[PDB]
Amino acid sequence: GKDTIADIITCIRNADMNRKGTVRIVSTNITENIVKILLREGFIENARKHQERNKYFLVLTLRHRRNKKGPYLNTFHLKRVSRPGLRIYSNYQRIPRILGGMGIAILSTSRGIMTDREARLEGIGGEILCYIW
Amino acid sequence: PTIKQLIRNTRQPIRNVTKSPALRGCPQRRGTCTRVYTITPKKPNSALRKVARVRLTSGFEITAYIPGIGHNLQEHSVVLVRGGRVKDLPGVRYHIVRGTLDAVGVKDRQQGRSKYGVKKPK
RNA sequence: GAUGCCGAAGGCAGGGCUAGUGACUGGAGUGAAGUCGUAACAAGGUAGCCGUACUGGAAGGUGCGGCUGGAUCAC
RNA sequence: GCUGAGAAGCAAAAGGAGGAAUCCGCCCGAGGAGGGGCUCGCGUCUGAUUAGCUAGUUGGUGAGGUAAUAGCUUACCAAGGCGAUGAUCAGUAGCUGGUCCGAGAGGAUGAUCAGCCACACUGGGACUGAGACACGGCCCAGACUCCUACGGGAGGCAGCAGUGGGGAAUUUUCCGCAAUGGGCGAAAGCCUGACGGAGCAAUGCCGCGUGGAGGCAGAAGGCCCACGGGUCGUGAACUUCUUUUCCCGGAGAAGAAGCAAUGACGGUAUCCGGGGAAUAAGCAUCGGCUAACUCUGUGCCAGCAGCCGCGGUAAGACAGAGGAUGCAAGCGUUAUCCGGAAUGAUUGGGCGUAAAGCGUCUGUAGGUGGCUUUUUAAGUCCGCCGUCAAAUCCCAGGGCUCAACCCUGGACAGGCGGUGGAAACUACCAAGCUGGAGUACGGUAGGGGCAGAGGGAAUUUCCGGUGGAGCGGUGAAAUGCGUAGAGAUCGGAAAGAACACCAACGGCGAAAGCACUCUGCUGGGCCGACACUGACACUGAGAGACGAAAGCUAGGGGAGCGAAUGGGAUUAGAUACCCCAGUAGUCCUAGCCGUAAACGAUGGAUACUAGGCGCUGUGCGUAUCGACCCGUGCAGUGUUGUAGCUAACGCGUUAAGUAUCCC
RNA sequence: CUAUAACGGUCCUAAGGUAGCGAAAUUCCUUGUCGGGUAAGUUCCGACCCGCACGAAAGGCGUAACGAUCUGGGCACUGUC
Ligand SMILES: [Mg+2]
Ligand SMILES: [Mg+2]
Ligand SMILES: [Mg+2]
Ligand SMILES: [Mg+2]
Ligand SMILES: [Mg+2]
Ligand SMILES: [Mg+2]
Ligand SMILES: [Mg+2]
Ligand SMILES: [Mg+2]
Ligand SMILES: [Mg+2]
Ligand SMILES: [Mg+2]
Ligand SMILES: [Mg+2]
Ligand SMILES: [Mg+2]
Ligand SMILES: [Mg+2]
Ligand SMILES: [Mg+2]
Ligand SMILES: [Mg+2]
Ligand SMILES: [Mg+2]
Ligand SMILES: [Mg+2]
Ligand SMILES: [Mg+2]
Ligand SMILES: [Mg+2]
Ligand SMILES: [Mg+2]
Ligand SMILES: [Mg+2]
Ligand SMILES: [Mg+2]
Ligand SMILES: [Mg+2]
Ligand SMILES: [Mg+2]
Ligand SMILES: [Mg+2]
Ligand SMILES: [Mg+2]
Ligand SMILES: [Mg+2]
Ligand SMILES: [Mg+2]
Ligand SMILES: [Mg+2]
Ligand SMILES: [Mg+2]
Ligand SMILES: [Mg+2]
Ligand SMILES: [Mg+2]
Ligand SMILES: [Mg+2]
Ligand SMILES: [Mg+2]
Ligand SMILES: [Mg+2]
Ligand SMILES: [Mg+2]
Ligand SMILES: [Mg+2]
Ligand SMILES: [Mg+2]
Ligand SMILES: [Mg+2]
Ligand SMILES: [Mg+2]
Ligand SMILES: [Mg+2]
Ligand SMILES: [Mg+2]
Ligand SMILES: [Mg+2]
Ligand SMILES: [Mg+2]
Ligand SMILES: [Mg+2]
Ligand SMILES: [Mg+2]
Ligand SMILES: [Mg+2]
Ligand SMILES: [Mg+2]
Ligand SMILES: [Mg+2]
Ligand SMILES: [Mg+2]
Ligand SMILES: [Mg+2]
Ligand SMILES: [Mg+2]
Ligand SMILES: [Mg+2]
Ligand SMILES: [Mg+2]
Ligand SMILES: [Mg+2]
Ligand SMILES: [Mg+2]
Ligand SMILES: [Mg+2]
Ligand SMILES: [Mg+2]
Ligand SMILES: [Mg+2]
Ligand SMILES: [Mg+2]
Ligand SMILES: [Mg+2]
Ligand SMILES: [Mg+2]
Ligand SMILES: [Mg+2]
Ligand SMILES: [Mg+2]
Ligand SMILES: [Mg+2]
Ligand SMILES: [Mg+2]
Ligand SMILES: [Mg+2]
Ligand SMILES: [Mg+2]
Ligand SMILES: [Mg+2]
Ligand SMILES: [Mg+2]
Ligand SMILES: [Mg+2]
Ligand SMILES: [Mg+2]
Ligand SMILES: [Mg+2]
Ligand SMILES: [Mg+2]
Ligand SMILES: [Mg+2]
Ligand SMILES: [Mg+2]
Ligand SMILES: [Mg+2]
Ligand SMILES: [Mg+2]
Ligand SMILES: [Mg+2]
Ligand SMILES: [Mg+2]
Ligand SMILES: [Mg+2]
Ligand SMILES: [Mg+2]
Ligand SMILES: [Mg+2]
Ligand SMILES: [Mg+2]
Ligand SMILES: [Mg+2]
Ligand SMILES: [Mg+2]
Ligand SMILES: [Mg+2]
Ligand SMILES: [Mg+2]
Ligand SMILES: [Mg+2]
Ligand SMILES: [Mg+2]
Ligand SMILES: [Mg+2]
Ligand SMILES: [Mg+2]
Ligand SMILES: [Mg+2]
Ligand SMILES: [Mg+2]
Ligand SMILES: [Mg+2]
Ligand SMILES: [Mg+2]
Ligand SMILES: [Mg+2]
Ligand SMILES: [Mg+2]
Ligand SMILES: [Mg+2]
Ligand SMILES: [Mg+2]
Ligand SMILES: [Mg+2]
Ligand SMILES: [Mg+2]
Ligand SMILES: [Mg+2]
Ligand SMILES: [Mg+2]
Ligand SMILES: [Mg+2]
Ligand SMILES: [Mg+2]
Ligand SMILES: [Mg+2]
Ligand SMILES: [Mg+2]
Ligand SMILES: [Mg+2]
Ligand SMILES: [Mg+2]
Ligand SMILES: [Mg+2]
Ligand SMILES: [Mg+2]
Ligand SMILES: [Mg+2]
Ligand SMILES: [Mg+2]
Ligand SMILES: [Mg+2]
Ligand SMILES: [Mg+2]
Ligand SMILES: [Mg+2]
Ligand SMILES: [Mg+2]
Ligand SMILES: [Mg+2]
Ligand SMILES: [Mg+2]
Ligand SMILES: [Mg+2]
Ligand SMILES: [Mg+2]
Ligand SMILES: [Mg+2]
Ligand SMILES: [Mg+2]
Ligand SMILES: [Mg+2]
Ligand SMILES: [Mg+2]
Ligand SMILES: [Mg+2]
Ligand SMILES: [Mg+2]
Ligand SMILES: [Mg+2]
Ligand SMILES: [Mg+2]
Ligand SMILES: [Mg+2]
Ligand SMILES: [Mg+2]
Ligand SMILES: [Mg+2]
Ligand SMILES: [Mg+2]
Ligand SMILES: [Mg+2]
Ligand SMILES: [Mg+2]
Ligand SMILES: [Mg+2]
């Protein structure tokens, strides 16, 4: 648990590859925000919170299998960019865009977390958390 | 691999190693022939190859190949040698430019004459 | 003018580093064809390999320990 | 103005032009701009087979010195300064605007052109001066060249040309101050091998040419041909048109700047006329990559080749011919650099078997590090300013007929510095929180380790009794042991070493390893409870400890086994396999060695991803109220196997899967 | 290819000289041959091995320190010359 962000991302990727809709993730401001964003983008069905023994679990419903489990044309990819060993930052004009914009990029900036779209409207650069296909 | 390790300078390039050290970074060098003789090629290529040992301006002694058909070269002759490798003979990394200094041009060669140092026939 | 201090070559001495060369000798590489053997690959005709010690013209042999990248048979 | 607390003390000049006006000067202050001197942050090659270096060295005072701060100098005081983030030492190198390459990230390099440094025959000094430790100045020493009437002198091309020499290789002992720039002068002007030009050279980049249009489909010739014909080929010859270039004549600039004058280039660039297709195409390649094919000549010869490789009688790979293809006033070969090369990998690789996981731990520096709230604003982000010289690259126009080249204007990057904001993430500051890591408590399994007791088979030898010919051994034998009584058998002693069954695809250990039994000293591990601390974590360069067997030093001990050694065979030989003997060693104490297929051929931590069948230790519920039994929670351990991974084999919750960190 | 002999045959013994060293306090022929030191070296140092006739407790081979030891060379110094 040296990195929480990468961990969330990873659990998602694993549950996804295994064709399961439901994931338990540990909550945190970052986690919660990231998931919110993930919802307003439409990458994930629904999110909700649970509590036991002062632990918080966000469970995430995931988009249903593609017209069977066997014949899948599409998966859902996640990639950590800035990680504890190398922190990647970008100014306004270097802000990444994924596959011509089909995917998104998550930024942590002065005004909070957002997508690259929001950064382009508001004109801010910052730290790039991950890429999402 | 580990960034921390890369910052100890764990990537270093392998320098370019020349194929003709005796030239010392030159297109050609002039030399005098110590000996002219023949050698047999590595099998299964059998023939008799024309080679001469040349002592150069850069001081080295090498063994260089003489192209074409026939030659007038003999000891205490001043020739000009150029690079390039003969896959046949072990140790022979150098040719002898034909048609300059003491090596005349190949007699009666009509085609690709520039390689062998031959005038154009009228 | 003379003289003191500092003073470059020049001198001597021992050092560190490198260049070349040297009777003889140790091994390495390539040489179709030479000599001696046949160690290795099949259970390679005593299973093979690693460490190590002793010995042998030479590949090697045996001892001690280890492993299967061991065949046969056990399933 | 300078010295100085002050009192005081001390310091300057130059005239020349003109008939006069006035001009160019002179001395002392005080500014300005430009040019220099210093000082500091950052960036500024390879080597650990270079690990300690430094004593005016690192600082303090007092005196000196410098244009100025300063160990710049000197005396005294103190003991620092630098260094595993690479000092010192060695090796290489002028650096930067830039140039070449690259999709980019960045690699290599520093010619011309522009800035800076450094040097001037080899070393060292100063002098003059605003400025030098001074290329065509001085002084000395040294090496070398010249002149000398031999007593003495002269000199410094890494200035322009030029000669020798070295070399694969790099140009005329040319013209001119007309332009621009310098120096001196009141000006006239003088000097400028800076510079402006010419000449030589395909060295390179760019433009143009070597003809345009038509040309019976008939002939000569080359070559191929199944002799039918194909192909050089509209190609030439041939007929017309044109004249860039060539040749012969004419005229002829801008460049020159405001009084005319003054042009090295040059009678050149350009413009007009007269002839006339007239003056002008080569070089590689043709096996595959790679575009382009056949024939004669040769026969593992002669030769080719960038790699693979061709060539022993019909060679698309040699040499010749014809034909074709590629480029074209160039075409090839060699050298150098980047590319392709993901082949040193940040973007962008790997480590079970292909090269590659230290033998295994403990841990120092170092790197990363859980959640919540606040703070700060170092990173990070946004705005504005300064600068990062001009030339080059990029964009937009303009000029030489075009292009190359030149000129104007402008800018993205990206760097550094100042300032105003933002506060999510890293970082900091203050307080919190348990799920990570620990402590206490209570349990429980264990060949964990060290130390001390005890036990039995078996074997060997020795002492007897019996007995009386072979034992032992091999594929078959023999050496060997035996009538001096062997082996066999019974009874006795003595000694050492190893621990049958249990034992199992079982247990513990960090690994190595650890098992007859017992007891003592002690290391961990796991499980259940909130009892508690509250991030104390994970890894680990150097460093430390442990580390099978063999081996060694010193002292013991010595049954069996057994390197070496000896004998017997086997065999062409047998320094081997087999047999008979048997020394080191194997054991114990105290050390050293530090290696193994030290293997899961798989570094460690964490998080997350179907199962099925098993086992060990425990806990819970159930079953009975104690052994099962069942279902389950953990911790480890084994076998099949889904997703996914992999070159395949296979791995697959004990990953070789999906991610993060360290080595 | 000349050479030499890792390899084989045979003879004889109780067995046939291993490690290391080697023209040596051991080498006869012999001032062996080669290298070095010297203008010139029968001595000296290093090496070859053809050890007349090395050799393992009559020890073999190394070796720092030491010697009124034996033996070669050099600087200083001198009537040794
Ligand atoms: Mg930046
Ligand atoms: Mg990488
Ligand atoms: Mg290359
Ligand atoms: Mg000196
Ligand atoms: Mg000396
Ligand atoms: Mg030899
Ligand atoms: Mg050899
Ligand atoms: Mg041969
Ligand atoms: Mg064999
Ligand atoms: Mg075998
Ligand atoms: Mg085998
Ligand atoms: Mg043996
Ligand atoms: Mg034996
Ligand atoms: Mg064994
Ligand atoms: Mg006065
Ligand atoms: Mg005066
Ligand atoms: Mg006058
Ligand atoms: Mg007057
Ligand atoms: Mg002034
Ligand atoms: Mg550089
Ligand atoms: Mg002092
Ligand atoms: Mg590239
Ligand atoms: Mg130059
Ligand atoms: Mg310059
Ligand atoms: Mg100077
Ligand atoms: Mg000179
Ligand atoms: Mg000087
Ligand atoms: Mg002065
Ligand atoms: Mg001067
Ligand atoms: Mg000077
Ligand atoms: Mg000069
Ligand atoms: Mg002099
Ligand atoms: Mg002089
Ligand atoms: Mg003079
Ligand atoms: Mg010159
Ligand atoms: Mg010359
Ligand atoms: Mg020359
Ligand atoms: Mg040239
Ligand atoms: Mg002028
Ligand atoms: Mg002027
Ligand atoms: Mg003036
Ligand atoms: Mg002139
Ligand atoms: Mg010029
Ligand atoms: Mg010409
Ligand atoms: Mg030209
Ligand atoms: Mg020309
Ligand atoms: Mg040329
Ligand atoms: Mg051209
Ligand atoms: Mg035509
Ligand atoms: Mg005309
Ligand atoms: Mg023209
Ligand atoms: Mg005028
Ligand atoms: Mg004309
Ligand atoms: Mg083709
Ligand atoms: Mg060819
Ligand atoms: Mg080439
Ligand atoms: Mg044939
Ligand atoms: Mg024939
Ligand atoms: Mg033929
Ligand atoms: Mg024919
Ligand atoms: Mg040909
Ligand atoms: Mg031809
Ligand atoms: Mg070329
Ligand atoms: Mg590369
Ligand atoms: Mg490589
Ligand atoms: Mg690889
Ligand atoms: Mg292998
Ligand atoms: Mg391997
Ligand atoms: Mg390991
Ligand atoms: Mg290993
Ligand atoms: Mg180790
Ligand atoms: Mg550790
Ligand atoms: Mg620490
Ligand atoms: Mg931290
Ligand atoms: Mg955090
Ligand atoms: Mg610029
Ligand atoms: Mg343009
Ligand atoms: Mg134009
Ligand atoms: Mg410009
Ligand atoms: Mg900027
Ligand atoms: Mg800034
Ligand atoms: Mg905050
Ligand atoms: Mg805290
Ligand atoms: Mg014990
Ligand atoms: Mg008993
Ligand atoms: Mg009897
Ligand atoms: Mg007998
Ligand atoms: Mg007896
Ligand atoms: Mg009796
Ligand atoms: Mg008996
Ligand atoms: Mg006993
Ligand atoms: Mg275990
Ligand atoms: Mg055991
Ligand atoms: Mg215990
Ligand atoms: Mg508390
Ligand atoms: Mg280590
Ligand atoms: Mg130890
Ligand atoms: Mg042992
Ligand atoms: Mg021994
Ligand atoms: Mg002993
Ligand atoms: Mg015994
Ligand atoms: Mg035995
Ligand atoms: Mg024997
Ligand atoms: Mg004996
Ligand atoms: Mg025998
Ligand atoms: Mg025995
Ligand atoms: Mg021991
Ligand atoms: Mg090893
Ligand atoms: Mg083992
Ligand atoms: Mg049961
Ligand atoms: Mg488990
Ligand atoms: Mg397995
Ligand atoms: Mg499996
Ligand atoms: Mg793998
Ligand atoms: Mg013979
Ligand atoms: Mg024999
Ligand atoms: Mg023999
Ligand atoms: Mg025999
Ligand atoms: Mg006998
Ligand atoms: Mg005997
Ligand atoms: Mg015998
Ligand atoms: Mg011997
Ligand atoms: Mg031996
Ligand atoms: Mg010897
Ligand atoms: Mg002698
Ligand atoms: Mg002796
Ligand atoms: Mg002797
Ligand atoms: Mg004698
Ligand atoms: Mg000599
Ligand atoms: Mg001699
Ligand atoms: Mg003497
Ligand atoms: Mg001697
Ligand atoms: Mg003897
Ligand atoms: Mg003796
Ligand atoms: Mg004796
Ligand atoms: Mg003695
Ligand atoms: Mg001694």
Ligand SMILES: [Mg+2]
């Ligand atoms: Mg004494």
Ligand SMILES: [Mg+2]
């Ligand atoms: Mg003295």
Ligand SMILES: [Mg+2]
């Ligand atoms: Mg006297």
